[PDB]
Amino acid sequence: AQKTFKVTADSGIHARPATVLVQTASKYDADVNLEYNGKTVNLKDIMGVMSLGIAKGAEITISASGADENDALNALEETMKSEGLGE
Amino acid sequence: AQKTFKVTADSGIHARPATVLVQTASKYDADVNLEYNGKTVNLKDIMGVMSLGIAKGAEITISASGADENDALNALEETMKSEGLGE
């Protein structure tokens, strides 16, 4: 499953935001990936999120795959809105 | 602990090389990471590894931390060399 979002967070996807993301994704039996410009990283590691250097205004795709993918994806979109990261 | 290497694979770190690295790193409990020109990704993440686009001649550093990080490292140097990826 996949969803595209626009980052609206002011400092882009920095330390706190990569963490709330890893945290939520970590709760699911599903492989969770983050994509920006053709580059994809596993979402369950802050290392590789920090590395993409995603700033405000960017568009990114979140994909999930596995037993719990619908729930995994719905949760991530809830954190993106609720943590004022994107929409 | 860490180890730096020089990539000598003509195609850099492409799908095959990334695959051998990841399979090797995955047998260990230590957290295992790859860094290239300031960007760091989890070595147990095929996606993140490919995202880096490491070409022939670059230098990369492999880091391993935890329980069996000396064996994780020797093991990765060995793959580095027997799989013709670098030295």
Swiss-Prot record, chains A, B:
Its main location: cytoplasm. Signal peptide: none annotated. The active site is at H14. Phosphorylated during sporulation. InterPro entries: HPr, HPr-like, HPr-like_sf, PTS_HPr_His_P_site, PTS_HPr_Ser_P_site. PANTHER family: PHOSPHOCARRIER PROTEIN HPR, PHOSPHOCARRIER PROTEIN NPR. Residues 1-87 form the HPr domain. Gene3D superfamilies: HPr-like. The keyword Transport applies. It is found in: Cytoplasm. GO terms for cellular component: cytoplasm. Belongs to the HPr family. This is Phosphocarrier protein HPr. The modification Tele-phosphohistidine is found at H14. It holds the Pfam family PTS-HPr. PROSITE patterns: PTS_HPR_DOM (PS51350), PTS_HPR_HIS (PS00369), PTS_HPR_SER (PS00589). One of its GO terms (biological process) is phosphoenolpyruvate-dependent sugar phosphotransferase system. CDD domains: PTS-HPr_like (cd00367). The modification Phosphoserine is found at S11, D45. General (non sugar-specific) component of the phosphoenolpyruvate-dependent sugar phosphotransferase system (sugar PTS). This major carbohydrate active-transport system catalyzes the phosphorylation of incoming sugar substrates concomitantly with their translocation across the cell membrane. The phosphoryl group from phosphoenolpyruvate (PEP) is transferred to the phosphoryl carrier protein HPr by enzyme I. Phospho-HPr then transfers it to the PTS EIIA domain. Keywords: Cytoplasm, Phosphoprotein, Phosphotransferase system, Sugar transport, Transcription, Transcription regulation, Transport. The keyword Phosphoprotein applies.
